[PDB]
Amino acid sequence: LSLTQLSSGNPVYEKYYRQVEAGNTGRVLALDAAAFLKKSGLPDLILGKIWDLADTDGKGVLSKQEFFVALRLVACAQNGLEVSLSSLSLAVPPPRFHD
């Protein structure tokens, strides 16, 4: 879906999506993303899967849903669930990231 359904269109996440964003253009270099993700708690291995499943647009840079996905996604492996979206859209627990 879209950010909307993602969380009734909660920009709260945008705050984070921008935290990783580098420069002053308004785009996530992605690289930084991995930085913010690593701030989760999960390993790089399990993470890799997230990114893999994340990356889709093409360019390293991240997007909306994309990033908004890998985010909650981390909360997936956080419970020991799958790392693919195929196992997403469930009642996964809360991540480690800040509130």
Swiss-Prot record:
Taxonomic lineage of the native organism: Eukaryota, Metazoa, Chordata, Craniata, Vertebrata
Boundaries of every EH domain copy: 9-98
Sequence ranges assigned to domain EF-hand in this UniProt record: 42-77
UniProt-recorded name of the protein: Epidermal growth factor receptor substrate 15
Domain of life: Eukaryota
Domain notes: The EH domain interacts with Asn-Pro-Phe (NPF) motifs of target proteins.
Record PTM text: Phosphorylated on serine upon DNA damage, probably by ATM or ATR. Not required for membrane translocation after EGF treatment or for targeting to coated pits, but essential for a subsequent step in EGFR endocytosis.
Taxonomic source organism: Mus musculus (Mouse)
Compartments reported by the entry: Cytoplasm; Cell membrane; Membrane, Clathrin-coated pit
Function comment: Involved in cell growth regulation. May be involved in the regulation of mitogenic signals and control of cell proliferation. Involved in the internalization of ligand-inducible receptors of the receptor tyrosine kinase (RTK) type, in particular EGFR. Plays a role in the assembly of clathrin-coated pits (CCPs). Acts as a clathrin adapter required for post-Golgi trafficking. Seems to be involved in CCPs maturation including invagination or budding.
Positions spanned in the full protein: 7 to 105 of 897
Subunit structure: Interacts with HGS; the interaction bridges the interaction of STAM or STAM2 with EPS15. Isoform 2 interacts with HGS and AP2A2. Part of a complex at least composed of EPS15, HGS, and either STAM or STAM2. Binds AP2A2. Interacts with AP2B1; clathrin competes with EPS15. Binds STON2. Interacts (via its SH3-binding sites) with CRK. Interacts with SH3BP4/TTP. Interacts with ERBB2. Interacts (via UIM repeats) with CORO7 (when ubiquitinated at 'Lys-472'). Interacts with FCHO1. Interacts with FCHO2. Interacts with SGIP1. Interacts (via EH domains) with DAB2.
